[PDB]
Design an enzyme around this catalytic site. Structure first.
Site, PDB file in Angstrom:
ATOM      1  N   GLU A 120      71.161  49.594  18.684  1.00 53.42           N
ATOM      2  CA  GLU A 120      70.994  50.699  17.577  1.00 53.42           C
ATOM      3  C   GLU A 120      72.346  51.733  17.201  1.00 53.42           C
ATOM      4  O   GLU A 120      72.285  51.867  16.208  1.00 53.42           O
ATOM      5  CB  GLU A 120      69.651  51.859  17.956  1.00 53.42           C
ATOM      6  N   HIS A 129      72.453  43.293  10.993  1.00 52.25           N
ATOM      7  CA  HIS A 129      72.293  42.003  11.928  1.00 52.25           C
ATOM      8  C   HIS A 129      73.265  40.984  11.552  1.00 52.25           C
ATOM      9  O   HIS A 129      73.469  40.647  10.359  1.00 52.25           O
ATOM     10  CB  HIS A 129      71.074  41.898  11.616  1.00 52.25           C
TER      11      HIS A 129
HETATM   12  N1  LIG Z   1      70.187  37.243  21.901  1.00 54.43           N
HETATM   13  C1  LIG Z   1      70.899  37.947  21.347  1.00 54.43           C
HETATM   14  N2  LIG Z   1      71.946  37.931  20.612  1.00 54.43           N
HETATM   15  N3  LIG Z   1      70.279  39.096  21.434  1.00 54.43           N
HETATM   16  C2  LIG Z   1      71.052  40.575  21.142  1.00 54.43           C
HETATM   17  C3  LIG Z   1      71.745  40.762  22.690  1.00 54.43           C
HETATM   18  C4  LIG Z   1      72.908  40.556  23.090  1.00 54.43           C
HETATM   19  C5  LIG Z   1      73.495  40.886  24.324  1.00 54.43           C
HETATM   20  C6  LIG Z   1      72.583  41.630  25.188  1.00 54.43           C
HETATM   21  C7  LIG Z   1      71.504  42.210  24.792  1.00 54.43           C
HETATM   22  C8  LIG Z   1      70.811  41.885  23.597  1.00 54.43           C
HETATM   23  C9  LIG Z   1      69.384  42.248  23.152  1.00 54.43           C
HETATM   24  C10 LIG Z   1      69.567  43.726  22.451  1.00 54.43           C
HETATM   25  C11 LIG Z   1      68.063  44.229  21.810  1.00 54.43           C
HETATM   26  C12 LIG Z   1      68.128  43.959  20.088  1.00 54.43           C
HETATM   27  C13 LIG Z   1      66.929  44.405  19.604  1.00 54.43           C
HETATM   28  C14 LIG Z   1      65.994  43.386  19.588  1.00 54.43           C
HETATM   29  C15 LIG Z   1      65.067  43.447  17.956  1.00 54.43           C
HETATM   30  C16 LIG Z   1      63.786  44.053  18.491  1.00 54.43           C
HETATM   31  C17 LIG Z   1      62.811  43.985  17.340  1.00 54.43           C
HETATM   32  C18 LIG Z   1      63.218  45.356  16.287  1.00 54.43           C
HETATM   33  O1  LIG Z   1      62.989  46.392  16.848  1.00 54.43           O
HETATM   34  N4  LIG Z   1      63.833  44.911  15.192  1.00 54.43           N
HETATM   35  C19 LIG Z   1      64.473  45.877  14.026  1.00 54.43           C
HETATM   36  C20 LIG Z   1      64.180  45.329  12.670  1.00 54.43           C
HETATM   37  C21 LIG Z   1      63.074  46.484  12.008  1.00 54.43           C
HETATM   38  C22 LIG Z   1      62.916  45.446  10.712  1.00 54.43           C
HETATM   39  C23 LIG Z   1      61.551  45.956  10.073  1.00 54.43           C
HETATM   40  N5  LIG Z   1      61.263  45.251   8.819  1.00 54.43           N
HETATM   41  C24 LIG Z   1      65.702  46.284  14.701  1.00 54.43           C
HETATM   42  O2  LIG Z   1      66.437  45.446  14.796  1.00 54.43           O
HETATM   43  N6  LIG Z   1      65.830  47.605  14.670  1.00 54.43           N
HETATM   44  O3  LIG Z   1      67.702  47.874  14.960  1.00 54.43           O
HETATM   45 ZN   LIG Z   2      68.710  45.910  14.559  1.00 51.31          ZN
END
Ligand SMILES: N=C(N)NCc1ccccc1CCCCCCCCCC(=O)N[C@H](CCCCN)C(=O)NO
Ligand SMILES: [Zn+2]
Ligand SMILES: [Ca+2]
Ligand SMILES: [Ca+2]
Ligand SMILES: [Ca+2]
Ligand SMILES: [Zn+2]
EC number: 3.4.24.17
Length: 171
Positions: A120, A129
């Site tokens: 965030e 993203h």
């Molecule tokens: N495997 C990898 N590379 N993971 C990263 C990654 C790389 C290394 C360590 C941890 C992570 C995970 C971090 C968590 C990221 C959040 C996951 C998304 C959850 C869904 C969500 O809340 N999405 C909204 C989108 C809202 C749109 C609505 N139309 C968003 O994105 N907000 O910010």
């Molecule tokens: Zn995001």
């Protein structure tokens, strides 16, 4: 990596943040710590620094909410959307909101606040993203993520430094 349209970015190096409210899920110190750690991840790859405010309007306002909470993007309850943040700018911009219908934890038994917060803050700094599956900015949370081996991918670094540049020096 990807940025926001118009490439919005903070026009200053010393930024401030503030935790507006607290979730019942964890003790206050656990929330403050997670946020501080999330900020540290970015401070070490840029010439930026962060200071905490306990009153007033900080650049990055952090809060927990559920369902409809004031903006055009209500939360969806447990699961799916975990949180969202806004690109750099005044007012609501740069702020980050966490869905409290999620079970925020200090570890990975539930939804790790630190990992989501780090992602965030990426948005709060101007990064959107990435399609790179290894990037912290790739929108996908997994409970099996190993916290001990956490680190920014080259795509995340390239992205953030394209906006603010690298740190003035390194060890
Ligand atoms: N495997 C990898 N590379 N993971 C990263 C990654 C790389 C290394 C360590 C941890 C992570 C995970 C971090 C968590 C990221 C959040 C996951 C998304 C959850 C869904 C969500 O809340 N999405 C909204 C989108 C809202 C749109 C609505 N139309 C968003 O994105 N907000 O910010
Ligand atoms: Zn995001
Ligand atoms: Ca703000
Ligand atoms: Ca949710
Ligand atoms: Ca909760
Ligand atoms: Zn919101």
């Amino acid at each position: 990596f990807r940025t926001f349209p118009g490439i919005p970015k903070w026009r200053k190096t010393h930024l401030t943040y503030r935790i507006v409210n607290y979730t019942p899920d964890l003790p206050k110190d656990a929330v403050d710590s997670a946020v501080e750690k999330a900020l540290k991840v970015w401070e070490e790859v840029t010439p930026l620094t962060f200071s905490r405010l306990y009153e007033g309007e900080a650049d990055i306002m952090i809060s927990f909410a559920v369902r409809e909470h004031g903006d055009f993007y209500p939360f969806d309850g447990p699961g799916n959307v975990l949180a969202h943040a806004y690109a750099p700018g005044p007012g609501i911009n740069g702020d980050a909101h966490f869905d409290d219908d999620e079970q925020w934890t200090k570890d990975t038994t539930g939804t790790n606040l630190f990992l989501v917060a780090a992602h965030e803050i990426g948005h709060s700094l101007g990064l959107f993203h990435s399609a790179n599956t290894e990037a912290l900015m790739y929108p996908l949370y997994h409970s099996l993520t190993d916290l001990t081996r956490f680190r920014l991918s080259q795509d995340d670094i390239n992205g953030i430094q394209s906006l603010y540049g690298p740190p003035p020096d390194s060890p």
